[PDB]
Amino acid sequence: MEGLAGYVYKAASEGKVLTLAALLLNRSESDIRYLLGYVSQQGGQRSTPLIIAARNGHAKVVRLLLEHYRVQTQQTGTVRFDGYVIDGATALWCAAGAGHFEVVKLLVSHGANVNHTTVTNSTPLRAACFDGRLDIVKYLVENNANISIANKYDNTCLMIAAYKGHTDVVRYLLEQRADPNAKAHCGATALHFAAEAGHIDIVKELIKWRAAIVVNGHGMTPLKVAAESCKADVVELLLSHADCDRRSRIEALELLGASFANDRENYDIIKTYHYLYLAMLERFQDGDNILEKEVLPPIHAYGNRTECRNPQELESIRQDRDALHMEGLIVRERILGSQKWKLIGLQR
């Protein structure tokens, strides 16, 4: 009966409804309950015939197990998604993460908990916003998915939708009273992830929904992380949308300019100089009260190398591909004072 569990999982995973039905016919429901509750290990995943079938889109197998062998939707396995290992995953969760709307439709109609949480505390709803499948998104919340359950890292459906550019999902969740101002563990809001990824449509949608402007846990506003991530269009939307002060306008322009320069041989030397110079023009608009650039402390000075402190010194290295890379490094340290921890919270 041990290896009989080998053939049940094979037939369910491959979608062979007629094969699976034959292996279960005329067996005790002590053995039937044993076989459909067996957790197999194969492609790095531990799951039941219910889960692997749901994960693979095999609806006729899912319908057979649900309504004919009366399998509990509660059962949880551990699956692989986007390189991540996800413990405590239900068949509902897998189905929503792989875009199997009719697998999701069956499982719900047989009473599956659409708010069941993985060990990552990820929900079927979250798994669906990850992929931006708005049809599954609308259906789950229509069947009472809590749009406010964040993952272990306090990351929200709205956050990951905003990060991956799913405009339609972002707009929908806000219509469903999603909280615009929730803060993840790192402190970012949905506006931070949208800005950092360059999705200007979602930036517009977030501000039109009265999204608050805040700093994350490292002193960064959406304007600043948009500038560090070199999202020039977002930077120039935010440089006028709010009433950011003179100092905020200069630092965004300088962080933006510096961010263009990191791959030393190939960066656009024009756009680097262009945003660096626009900042100094602003720094010098009044010839009497000049916003002088801050000097680095002596114990952190870049040797005999100093930031250009006037328009002419900047024009002096305008064509020097290497000197402008040096400038960017100084500007970023003079302003910005890892990504692994922010990526793990954006996970499905």
Q: Which residues are at the interface with a second copy (CB under 8 A)?
A: 30, 33-34, 37-39, 48, 72-77, 87-88, 90, 108-109, 111-117, 119, 121, 143-144, 146, 148, 152-153, 183, 185-187, 214-219, 245, 247, 292, 294-300, 336-337, 341, 344
Pairwise CA distance, residues 44 & 34, whole Å: 22
DSSP string, 79-123: EEETTEEEEEEEHHHHHHHTT-HHHHHHHHHTT--TT---TT---
Which residues are within 8 A (CB) of 303 and not within 5 positions of it... i.e. 6 or more apart?
none
Which residues are within 8 A (CB) of 237 and not within 5 positions of it... i.e. 6 or more apart?
200, 203, 204
Is position 185 annotated in a ligand binding site? yes
CB 166 within 8 A of CB 197: no
Is position 116 annotated in a ligand binding site? no
Pairwise CA distance, residues 78 & 195, whole Å: 33
Pairwise CA distance, residues 69 & 104, whole Å: 18
Is position 218 annotated in a ligand binding site? yes
Pairwise CA distance, residues 278 & 280, whole Å: 6
State which residue, 31 or 135, has the beta carbon closest to a second copy: 31
Give the position of tokens 């905003």. 162
State which residue, 39 or 269, has the beta carbon closest to a second copy: 39
Residues in the annotated binding site for Zn(2+): 185-186, 218
Residues in the annotated binding site: 185-186, 218
